[PDB]
RNA sequence: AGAUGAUCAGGUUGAUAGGUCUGAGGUGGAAGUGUGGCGACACAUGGAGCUGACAGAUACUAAUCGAUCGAGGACUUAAC
RNA sequence: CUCAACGAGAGACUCGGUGAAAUUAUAGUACCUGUGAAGAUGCAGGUUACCCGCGACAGGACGGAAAGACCCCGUGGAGC
RNA sequence: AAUGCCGGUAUGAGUAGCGAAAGAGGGGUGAGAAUCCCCUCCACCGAAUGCCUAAGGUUUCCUGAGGAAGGCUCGUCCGC
RNA sequence: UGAGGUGUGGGUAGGGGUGAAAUGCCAAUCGAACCUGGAGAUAGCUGGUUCUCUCCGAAAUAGCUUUAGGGCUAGCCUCAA
RNA sequence: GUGACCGAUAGUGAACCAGUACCGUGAGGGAAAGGUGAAAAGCACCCCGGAAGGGGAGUGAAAGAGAUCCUGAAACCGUG
RNA sequence: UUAAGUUAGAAAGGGCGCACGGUGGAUGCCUUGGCACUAGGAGCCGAUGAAGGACGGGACGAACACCGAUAUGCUUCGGGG
């Protein structure tokens, strides 16, 4: 049937992208926790 | 009740 | 006595024992012809080990191969390759790719 | 009772026609043993149809022989081959136009193979 | 349809008594050998009583 | 006879299976040719043609050559 | 259905290749009548039973799968 | 001895399964062919099982070698 | 042919949204989504608790208790003076 | 610079291309995996095999030391 | 030779013991890394563009580290041969 994940790169970059998270202090804290753990991929 | 309806 | 070991070729050991239990103790002249006609497709591998043992007897010791007889015909198990087969409703059952050590020892009678 | 050979009856008829015609051109084919046993009676029946040589027997044989070329650079069909070569070759012999010779088992499935030839 | 107890080694070996397979009906080929299973054409020489028919 | 084993009929001084021939039964009047009709069609050749496992004949084909298993018969007591 | 009988295909059966899973205290794991935590393959008395498999059925192993959902308790919780 | 955690290995067991739906034969390569290549029949879809073009994947496309592991078998073949 | 299906781009976020109203749905999750922290919450409840030998050896009773399968004090046990 | 601190299921999640592989749309969750020999001196050469893998012959103190490679237990599988 | 008795051996396969192996990484040694601290220092970096990354740069195939189209680097001042 139609499953949950229907991929679209524009929607992914609009919702979970770098500029979406840099536009609020919430996503800035998300990126700070991402850098503090040392993950290679910071955002979508 | 004791209904055998195990899933 | 000459010895040849297969050492990690891809065949399950239980299927190799079904040929090795009957090939054991026979003369080598009546042993290749058993392997040619069985057919039981581990038997070409057992044939390769048997010809390797006969050639090791002929070249390294000169044991006059027409007089040879099979002495030791044990089958051991090698390392198992682990594979997973998907099933219904997300079960992920395990599949064992078995591996055997085929060893044939020939000597005089 | 005849064999079913694991096929549908239409598939049985098509495979038997294919094997009969292919035996009729190539004169020696290698199949399984039970296919050989089912094929030999049909092949000798079609040779018996070729023995008569009349138009009605040829039209009976045309309903079974498939349209494949028998002899190259001669434009001979298989149906012409039955009534030109095989019938004249087996004019004296009364039955037994084929023999089956068994081979060893097959590698891929353990199938006992057989050689079929027109004799 | 669920095994109540596991099978022991001895019961498993007793069940595997008849799992062995027999020696084929192999005989001397009159042309070359060796050897040839009965009622089949020899794979070595391709002969059968006694013409080379391949 | 039968899931497979097994059982039964048989393996070239022989009818075990297939083919061939002749039959039983089934279906119903084959193809081609000719006649009548503008034609669809009908009639004659002709109980025709065809026919899977049902019979009887016939070694034409396959059951080849071969190989394996298989006993030298314990001791007492009564007559021999 | 009375009342079921055939036929076709796929699986099941045989062979060749590959090859899991639930479960599992150990197990050389009969029946009857009793006894027992009050419903016994394992206890007592008796009755039967050469060893090992293959194809089937599902009466038992209070079978397996889910720390019963019913009922009760918790000076547990959640929604109204 | 926690329906403990992790790792290894058994039982079930050479058992279930090997995932809709047509293949057959003759040549070729090769150590090895029911599965690879060629040819001839036969079969299937055909308001598609045809053509292209998004989203998506991103090298999966072509050629030459190769076959360890992955092709639920094999493999000389492949989206390896 | 319509209170129609569907594509793309968007909006409403959990004591909230949305609901032709079922306690339905909100990423296989819903009488209150998921993740991380308080947090090793708490559990009068169930399970578990790892070497040996010797000496002595119980109780399942009374009272009280939002107490009845929990607790406290007496009764019974052990060691020392 | 020091431990009546740990020694590869321990000690940082991470002694090793580790916040990596992998899972999730996302926030986030999050592994497993050390050891030849002192020195590669890593088995020239011969035979079987298509190769892998063996048996000789060599290097080495040890080749049962030969690429998850020091020692190598038990479950498990085998042969007498 | 008969009749009646009494015994051994029988193994398709199996059980126990012993011998020889395979699988596996427990144990024993063993650190290349960690955990606590001590005595001192250092406690900020950035529009003269930070922290952190993407993309690249080696004759040579991918990655770690290093570096930035002056790219596996470039000067000056010392150490060292």
Curated annotation (Swiss-Prot), chain A:
One of its GO terms (biological process) is translation. Residues 1-19 have a biased composition (Basic residues). Keywords: Ribonucleoprotein, Ribosomal protein. One of its GO terms (cellular component) is ribosome. Pfam families: Ribosomal_L34 (PF00468). The keyword Plastid does not apply. InterPro entries: Ribosomal_bL34, Ribosomal_bL34_CS. One of its GO terms (molecular function) is structural constituent of ribosome. PROSITE patterns: RIBOSOMAL_L34. Residues 1-27 are annotated as: Disordered. Belongs to the bacterial ribosomal protein bL34 family. Part of the 50S ribosomal subunit. This is Large ribosomal subunit protein bL34. It comes from Bacillus subtilis (strain 168).
Swiss-Prot record, chain C:
Belongs to the universal ribosomal protein uL22 family. Part of the 50S ribosomal subunit. The keyword ATP-binding does not apply. One of its GO terms (cellular component) is cytosolic large ribosomal subunit. The gene is rplV. Transmembrane segments: none annotated. Pfam families: Ribosomal_L22. The keyword rRNA-binding applies. Keywords: Ribonucleoprotein, Ribosomal protein, RNA-binding, rRNA-binding. This protein binds specifically to 23S rRNA; its binding is stimulated by other ribosomal proteins, e.g. L4, L17, and L20. It is important during the early stages of 50S assembly. It makes multiple contacts with different domains of the 23S rRNA in the assembled 50S subunit and ribosome. The globular domain of the protein is located near the polypeptide exit tunnel on the outside of the subunit, while an extended beta-hairpin is found that lines the wall of the exit tunnel in the center of the 70S ribosome. InterPro entries: Ribosomal_uL22, Ribosomal_uL22_bac/chlpt-type, Ribosomal_uL22_bac/org-type, Ribosomal_uL22_CS, Ribosomal_uL22_sf. The lineage of its organism: Bacteria, Bacillati, Bacillota, Bacilli, Bacillales. GO terms for molecular function: rRNA binding; structural constituent of ribosome. GO terms for biological process: translation. This is Large ribosomal subunit protein uL22. It comes from the Bacteria.
Curated annotation (Swiss-Prot), chain D:
It holds the Pfam family Ribosomal_L17. It comes from the Bacteria. The keyword rRNA-binding does not apply. Keywords: Ribonucleoprotein, Ribosomal protein. The keyword Hydrolase does not apply. Part of the 50S ribosomal subunit. Contacts protein L32. NCBIfam families: L17. Belongs to the bacterial ribosomal protein bL17 family. This is Large ribosomal subunit protein bL17. It comes from Bacillus subtilis (strain 168).
UniProtKB/Swiss-Prot annotation, chain E:
InterPro entries: Ribosomal_bL32, Ribosomal_bL32_bact, Ribosomal_zn-bd. GO terms for biological process: translation. The keyword Ribonucleoprotein applies. SUPFAM superfamilies: Zn-binding ribosomal proteins (SSF57829). It comes from the Bacteria. The keyword Ribonucleoprotein applies. One of its GO terms (molecular function) is structural constituent of ribosome. Belongs to the bacterial ribosomal protein bL32 family. Part of the 50S ribosomal subunit. This is Large ribosomal subunit protein bL32. It comes from Bacillus subtilis (strain 168). The gene is rpmF.
């Amino acid at each position: 049937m139609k499953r949950t994940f229907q991929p679209n790169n524009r929607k992914r970059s609009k919702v979970h992208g770098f500029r979406s998270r840099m536009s609020s202090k919430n996503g800035r804290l998300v990126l700070a926790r991402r850098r503090r753990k040392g993950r290679k991929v910071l955002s979508a | 009740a004791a209904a055998a309806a195990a899933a | 006595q000459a010895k040849a070991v297969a050492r990690t070729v891809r065949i399950a050991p239980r299927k190799a024992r079904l040929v090795m239990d009957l090939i054991r103790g026979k003369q080598v002249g009546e042993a290749v012809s058993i392997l040619n006609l069985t057919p039981r497709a581990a038997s070409p591998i057992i044939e390769k080990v048997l010809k390797s043992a006969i050639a090791n007897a002929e070249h390294n010791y000169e044991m006059d191969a027409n007089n040879l007889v099979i002495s030791q015909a044990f089958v051991d198990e090698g390392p198992t390759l682990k594979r997973f087969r998907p099933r219904a409703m997300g079960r992920a059952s395990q599949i064992n790719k078995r591996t055997s050590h085929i060893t044939i020892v020939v000597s005089e009678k | 009772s005849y064999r079913k050979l694991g096929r549908t009856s239409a598939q049985r008829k098509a495979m038997l026609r294919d094997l009969t015609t292919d035996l009729i051109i190539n004169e020696r084919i290698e199949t399984t043993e039970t296919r050989a046993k089912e094929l030999r009676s049909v092949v000798e029946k079609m040779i018996t149809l070729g023995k008569r040589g009349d138009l009605h027997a040829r039209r009976q044989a045309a309903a079974y022989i498939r349209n494949e070329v028998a002899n190259e650079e001669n434009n001979q069909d298989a149906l012409q081959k039955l009534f030109s070569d095989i019938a004249t070759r087996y004019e004296e012999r009364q039955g037994g136009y084929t023999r089956i010779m068994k081979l060893g088992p097959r590698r891929g499935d353990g199938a006992p193979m057989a050689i079929i030839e027109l004799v | 349809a669920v095994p109540f107890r596991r099978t022991s080694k001895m019961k498993k070996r007793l069940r595997r008594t008849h799992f062995k397979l027999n020696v084929p009906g192999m005989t001397e080929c009159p042309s070359c050998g060796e050897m040839k299973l009965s009622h089949r054409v020899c794979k070595a020489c391709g002969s059968y009583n006694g013409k080379d028919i391949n």
